[PDB]
RNA sequence: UUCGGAGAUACUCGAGUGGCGAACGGGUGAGUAACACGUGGGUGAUCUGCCCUGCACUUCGGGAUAAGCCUGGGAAACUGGGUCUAAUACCGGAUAGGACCACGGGAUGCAUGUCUUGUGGUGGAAAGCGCUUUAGCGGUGUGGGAUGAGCCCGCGGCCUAUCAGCUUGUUGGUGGGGUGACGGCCUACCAAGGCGACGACGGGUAGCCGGCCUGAGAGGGUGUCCGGCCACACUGGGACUGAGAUACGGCCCAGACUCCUACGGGAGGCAGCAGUGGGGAAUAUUGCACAAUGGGCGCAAGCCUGAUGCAGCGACGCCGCGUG
RNA sequence: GCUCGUAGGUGGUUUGUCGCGUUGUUCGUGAAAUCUCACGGCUUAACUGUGAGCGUGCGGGCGAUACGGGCAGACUAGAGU
């Protein structure tokens with residue numbers, strides 16, 4: 001299942017703008033509802049729950065799928081908040097966002113889900129594909145001369161492309177150099193509170 | 201017509217029995233001696249070395265063993281209902 | 296008596312197999328006496344490995360292979376070097392060596408520059 | 409019975425029982441006759457009924473009626489009764 | 494050649510004899526607190542069909558029987574008698590050391606001994622069939638492997654002392670008997686022992702394990718799918734056949750319960766796969782296929798296989814994706 | 818309530834020795850599956866294959882003797898006369 005609801009409503013509760021730029025946010029940066037402007041009680045469980053909610057609705061990942069990401073983030077060496085954002089970033093719909101082939105996160109999910117992309121010449125239609133090192137992310141030969149794909153051509157300059165992937169020319173195909181460590185990950189969220197949420 | 205008619209056996213190394221050393225508690229069983237073994241072993245949970253004893257019945261071809269008698273044994277074929285050991289030799293007898 | 300047989304241990308639509316030495320009075324996935332090989336009949340040629348110094352021990356001592364394992368020991372050549380046939384070399388063939396994952400990535404960087 | 413081969417085998421388990429019982433009873437009335445001559449202290453018939461009792465045991469062991477280690481255990485016992493008389 | 498009967502001579506084949514299989518596979522957890530299981534040993538105390546390999550051999554005869562045919566009894570299930578015919582069925586001889594007994598050598602040790610050799614005295618086997626004319630499959634005695642299995646022992650895993658004296662074939666010895674094998678396993682006499690507060694004897698409960706769930710670990714609960722082992726096949730006992738038997742779809746007897754009967758007597762055992770009734774909070778289709786893999790027989794083609802491979806059904810669980 | 822004492826648990830200083838406990842190392846074993854790691858194959862994942870760990874143990878051979886213990890002695894501080 002997907003959320004399929006209002007997107008500003010879960011950017012107002014978390015007090016943090018989740019999608020890239022929003023005018024409905026910053027007119028009302030307080031949580032929604034009829035009791036929207038009230039003084040909230042700053043608990044410790046609230047700081048740990050809402051920080052996990054920043055990570056789910058930024059990426060569009062349900063709870064029984066986000067929990068399995070934690071079950072292998074704590075089990076790999078290194079840290080836990082590092083490798084949690086590493087395996088969340090390598091989802092293929094998040095690759096289409098960072099490569100500048102989509103406007104928001106919810107259309108980068110459809111363009112993978114409706115089957116507009118290959119990887120190694122293999123037709124994928126799952127958003128939760130985890131790209132490894134040296135993967136090419138190619139677009140289908142049929143899906144050129146298409147309206148949402150030609151709008152991603154001239155608009156390849158307004159958002160920064162991270163250093164862990166590379167976009168090339170007239171073939172809009174994405175080359176994955178390595179899995180990103182920390183620095184080229186965009187930060188609306190702190191990472192140690194998601195690790196402390198599941199410790200309860 | 202060319203083979204040797206007796207293939208020799210593949211040489212199997214002779215497996216050994218167990219040998220233990222105990223005292224003698226009973227002798228009045230007419231060619232049967234009774235040996236009290238001892239054994240020390242860790243407890244599975246508390247880690248203390250626990251001393252436990254057994255009683256085994258061994259075989260005498262000649263009834264010469266008093267009460268005392270550091271003995272030495274070696275386990276055998278079933279010689280009776282409960283006899284499984286034999287007296288090999290006696291060292292520093294009943295003093 | 297002693298047989299050399301296959302053991303089905305894959306998924307539902309992926310019948311993996313192991314070449315295993317067992318008694319005839321035993322179910323398929325019972326205790327093998329010794330596992331000596333494997334056979335994956337889903338790749339484009341096949342994926343066949345026989346240990347070839349343990350398959351010579353069991354054939355010399357009396358293990359009768361079953362009729363689909365007999366076709367495998369003729370292919371790898373372990374049957375012909377036991378009965379003394381002139382097809383003693385292995386006539387098995389492996390899959391086509393694909394260009395590796397690093398090679399395609401360096402081919403794509405040079406394709407743009 | 410129910411299976412077709414099981415009616416076949418019931419008819420052959422009884423042919424084999426009447427066959428083997430006649431052979432085993434011939435061994436018991438030939439070991440016993442040796443025990444008469446051995447207990448009387450004869451040494452005349454006991455030296456030559458041993459040669460005909462052991463020969464009946466080996467024929468009963470080749471016919472599958474008794475096992476070969478059973479024939480060896482009965483010939484060793486009758487021969488050690490001869491050597492002590 | 495009647496126009497719907499004759500001709501085994503003849504590939505093919507019902508019933509029948511004979512070989513092998515049927516002790517595997519599949520199900521269930523009632524019983525068992527035990528060498529049942531886990532683990533590591535012992536077997537100088539043993540067995541092992543079919544398979545592989547080394548060496549010898551495959552030799553003379555004999556009497557019957559099922560079927561067939563003719564008949565008697567019975568309501569049936571089934572069964573008695575007379576004639577008649579074979580074999581790789583059966584029985585009796587000749588020759589063949591790993592059967593036995595006595596006396597010796599040579600090697601080794603772990604006390605009984607064990608393996609290897611020699612002499613004398615006693616003994617044990619079998620079977621043929623097929624052939625487009627380098628089709629081919631078998632038979633028997635034995636040395637040695639491989640696999641499977643039996644038996645014994647160390648240590649390990651429940652609650653209860655408001656169960657404290659249990660045991661007389663019980664503990665040990667000798668002479669016999671028995672067994673594949675050691676052994677009170679059995680028997681006759683002789684000795685008076687054996688176990689126990691480190692829980693004997695008794696009562697309650699329970700199939701055991703790899704594993705599964707939880708936990709920071711140590712521990713605690715559990716034994717369901719899958720895989721190993723054990724136990725049982727309507728209840729209780731018992732042998733038989735065979736290399737191998739808790740003999741699930743075998744035999745005999747007794748008991749309970751269904752069913753047939755002409756009242757004399759007979760028949761049956763889903764804890765195999767589906768399925769019905771019942772109990773219950775609650776658990777499914779009287780499905781397809783021998784294509785794949787494993788097994789049985791056959792030289793083989795093949796035949797057999799509710800093992801198995803699959804499908805049907807239930808959100809019952811995990812995983813993935815949609816409803817923009 | 819308090820002492821006495823049976824089985825049991827525990828033991829001062831020191832010399833020598835055996836190597837049972839302990840400890841080092843090596844071969845046999847600890848089936849496969851499950852489990853953790855690393856890659857590979859089903860469009861991903863569950864699932865599945867391969868390689869390595871794991872299997873806390875137990876048996877056989879060869880090293881060590883500080884400590885515990887067994888054996889054969891010595892000593893006077895504890896204990897008794």
Ligand SMILES: [Mg+2]
Nearest residue numbers: 001062064812
């Ligand atoms: Mg889900």
Ligand SMILES: [Mg+2]
Nearest residue numbers: 279280666667
């Ligand atoms: Mg005795």
Ligand SMILES: [Mg+2]
Nearest residue numbers: 412413416417
């Ligand atoms: Mg038949």
Ligand SMILES: [Mg+2]
Nearest residue numbers: 433434436437
């Ligand atoms: Mg008579």
Ligand SMILES: [Mg+2]
Nearest residue numbers: 481482484485
């Ligand atoms: Mg005897």
Ligand SMILES: [Mg+2]
Nearest residue numbers: 506507508509
């Ligand atoms: Mg026929």
Ligand SMILES: [Mg+2]
Nearest residue numbers: 512513631791
């Ligand atoms: Mg045959």
Ligand SMILES: [Mg+2]
Nearest residue numbers: 516517740741
């Ligand atoms: Mg059975």
Ligand SMILES: [Mg+2]
Nearest residue numbers: 556557578579
């Ligand atoms: Mg005739």
Ligand SMILES: [Mg+2]
Nearest residue numbers: 587588616617
């Ligand atoms: Mg003769």
Ligand SMILES: [Mg+2]
Nearest residue numbers: 584585618619
């Ligand atoms: Mg003959």
Ligand SMILES: [Mg+2]
Nearest residue numbers: 662680681682
């Ligand atoms: Mg008596």
Ligand SMILES: [Mg+2]
Nearest residue numbers: 668669670676
């Ligand atoms: Mg005796």
Ligand SMILES: [Mg+2]
Nearest residue numbers: 666667668677
């Ligand atoms: Mg006796």
Ligand SMILES: [Mg+2]
Nearest residue numbers: 522523699700
């Ligand atoms: Mg029960």
Ligand SMILES: [Mg+2]
Nearest residue numbers: 708709710712
């Ligand atoms: Mg805790």
